[PDB]
Symmetry: C2
Subunit: 66 residues, 2 copies
Protein backbone atom coordinates (compact mmCIF):
# COMPACT_ATOMS: atom_id res chain seq x y z
CA UNK A 1 0.00 0.00 0.00
CA UNK A 2 1.97 2.97 -1.32
CA UNK A 3 0.44 6.20 -0.08
CA UNK A 4 0.95 9.30 -2.19
CA UNK A 5 1.39 12.76 -0.69
CA UNK A 6 -0.37 15.85 -2.03
CA UNK A 7 -0.94 19.17 -0.28
CA UNK A 8 -4.38 20.76 -0.51
CA UNK A 9 -3.81 24.19 -2.10
CA UNK A 10 -7.02 25.66 -0.67
CA UNK A 11 -7.68 26.05 3.06
CA UNK A 12 -9.79 29.20 2.65
CA UNK A 13 -12.50 30.11 0.11
CA UNK A 14 -14.12 33.29 -1.18
CA UNK A 15 -17.88 33.48 -1.80
CA UNK A 16 -17.94 37.04 -3.12
CA UNK A 17 -16.93 36.27 -6.68
CA UNK A 18 -19.13 36.78 -9.74
CA UNK A 19 -18.70 35.00 -13.06
CA UNK A 20 -17.66 38.33 -14.64
CA UNK A 21 -14.70 38.74 -12.22
CA UNK A 22 -13.07 35.54 -13.47
CA UNK A 23 -10.56 35.07 -16.29
CA UNK A 24 -10.74 31.26 -15.93
CA UNK A 25 -11.13 28.39 -13.48
CA UNK A 26 -8.50 25.85 -12.41
CA UNK A 27 -9.84 22.61 -10.96
CA UNK A 28 -7.08 20.75 -9.16
CA UNK A 29 -6.78 16.98 -9.35
CA UNK A 30 -6.75 16.62 -5.56
CA UNK A 31 -10.06 14.75 -4.94
CA UNK A 32 -8.77 14.29 -1.41
CA UNK A 33 -9.39 18.03 -0.76
CA UNK A 34 -12.66 19.76 0.10
CA UNK A 35 -11.73 22.80 -2.03
CA UNK A 36 -10.49 22.06 -5.53
CA UNK A 37 -11.50 25.24 -7.39
CA UNK A 38 -9.21 28.18 -7.98
CA UNK A 39 -10.25 31.24 -9.97
CA UNK A 40 -7.77 33.46 -11.77
CA UNK A 41 -9.22 36.98 -11.52
CA UNK A 42 -9.50 39.67 -14.20
CA UNK A 43 -7.84 43.08 -13.79
CA UNK A 44 -5.32 42.03 -11.11
CA UNK A 45 -4.59 38.39 -11.95
CA UNK A 46 -4.89 37.28 -8.33
CA UNK A 47 -5.68 33.62 -7.76
CA UNK A 48 -8.29 32.78 -5.18
CA UNK A 49 -10.01 29.61 -4.05
CA UNK A 50 -13.72 30.01 -4.50
CA UNK A 51 -16.86 28.72 -2.87
CA UNK A 52 -17.84 25.51 -4.78
CA UNK A 53 -21.46 26.38 -4.09
CA UNK A 54 -21.61 29.50 -6.26
CA UNK A 55 -24.47 28.96 -8.69
CA UNK A 56 -22.66 30.43 -11.69
CA UNK A 57 -19.95 27.79 -11.49
CA UNK A 58 -22.16 24.98 -12.78
CA UNK A 59 -23.44 27.25 -15.56
CA UNK A 60 -19.86 28.15 -16.41
CA UNK A 61 -19.05 24.40 -16.58
CA UNK A 62 -22.15 24.03 -18.75
CA UNK A 63 -21.59 21.26 -21.32
CA UNK A 64 -19.06 19.28 -19.27
CA UNK A 65 -21.96 18.67 -16.86
CA UNK A 66 -25.32 19.62 -18.45
CA UNK B 1 -6.26 39.21 -32.63
CA UNK B 2 -7.46 37.50 -29.42
CA UNK B 3 -8.07 33.95 -30.68
CA UNK B 4 -9.67 30.93 -29.01
CA UNK B 5 -7.12 28.84 -27.08
CA UNK B 6 -8.38 25.53 -28.49
CA UNK B 7 -8.78 24.58 -32.15
CA UNK B 8 -7.72 20.94 -31.90
CA UNK B 9 -8.57 18.50 -29.11
CA UNK B 10 -7.30 15.26 -27.60
CA UNK B 11 -9.67 12.46 -26.58
CA UNK B 12 -7.10 10.13 -25.00
CA UNK B 13 -5.96 11.35 -21.58
CA UNK B 14 -5.59 9.29 -18.40
CA UNK B 15 -6.93 11.08 -15.35
CA UNK B 16 -3.75 9.92 -13.58
CA UNK B 17 -1.72 12.11 -15.90
CA UNK B 18 -3.64 15.30 -15.12
CA UNK B 19 -2.38 17.86 -12.60
CA UNK B 20 -5.40 20.13 -13.08
CA UNK B 21 -7.95 21.29 -15.63
CA UNK B 22 -8.03 24.91 -16.75
CA UNK B 23 -11.54 25.85 -17.85
CA UNK B 24 -12.49 28.85 -19.98
CA UNK B 25 -15.94 29.88 -21.14
CA UNK B 26 -16.25 33.01 -23.28
CA UNK B 27 -19.02 34.20 -25.60
CA UNK B 28 -16.79 33.76 -28.63
CA UNK B 29 -15.08 30.46 -27.69
CA UNK B 30 -17.71 28.68 -25.60
CA UNK B 31 -16.46 26.02 -23.15
CA UNK B 32 -12.80 25.03 -23.61
CA UNK B 33 -10.87 22.64 -21.38
CA UNK B 34 -7.08 22.58 -21.13
CA UNK B 35 -5.31 19.95 -19.04
CA UNK B 36 -1.87 20.44 -17.55
CA UNK B 37 -0.22 17.04 -17.83
CA UNK B 38 1.84 15.47 -15.06
CA UNK B 39 4.31 13.58 -17.22
CA UNK B 40 5.50 16.57 -19.26
CA UNK B 41 3.87 19.71 -17.82
CA UNK B 42 2.32 20.46 -21.23
CA UNK B 43 -1.08 22.05 -21.70
CA UNK B 44 -3.41 20.11 -23.95
CA UNK B 45 -6.91 20.93 -25.17
CA UNK B 46 -9.18 18.02 -24.40
CA UNK B 47 -12.50 16.75 -25.67
CA UNK B 48 -14.98 17.99 -23.06
CA UNK B 49 -16.86 14.74 -23.59
CA UNK B 50 -14.17 12.52 -22.11
CA UNK B 51 -15.67 9.89 -19.80
CA UNK B 52 -14.04 10.91 -16.52
CA UNK B 53 -14.46 14.68 -16.98
CA UNK B 54 -18.08 14.82 -15.77
CA UNK B 55 -17.28 12.81 -12.66
CA UNK B 56 -14.13 14.87 -12.06
CA UNK B 57 -16.18 18.10 -12.09
CA UNK B 58 -19.14 16.74 -10.11
CA UNK B 59 -16.82 15.71 -7.29
CA UNK B 60 -15.30 19.21 -7.15
CA UNK B 61 -18.74 20.83 -6.88
CA UNK B 62 -19.58 18.79 -3.79
Amino acid sequence: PVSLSYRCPCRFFESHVARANVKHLKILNTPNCALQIVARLKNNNRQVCIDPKLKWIQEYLEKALN
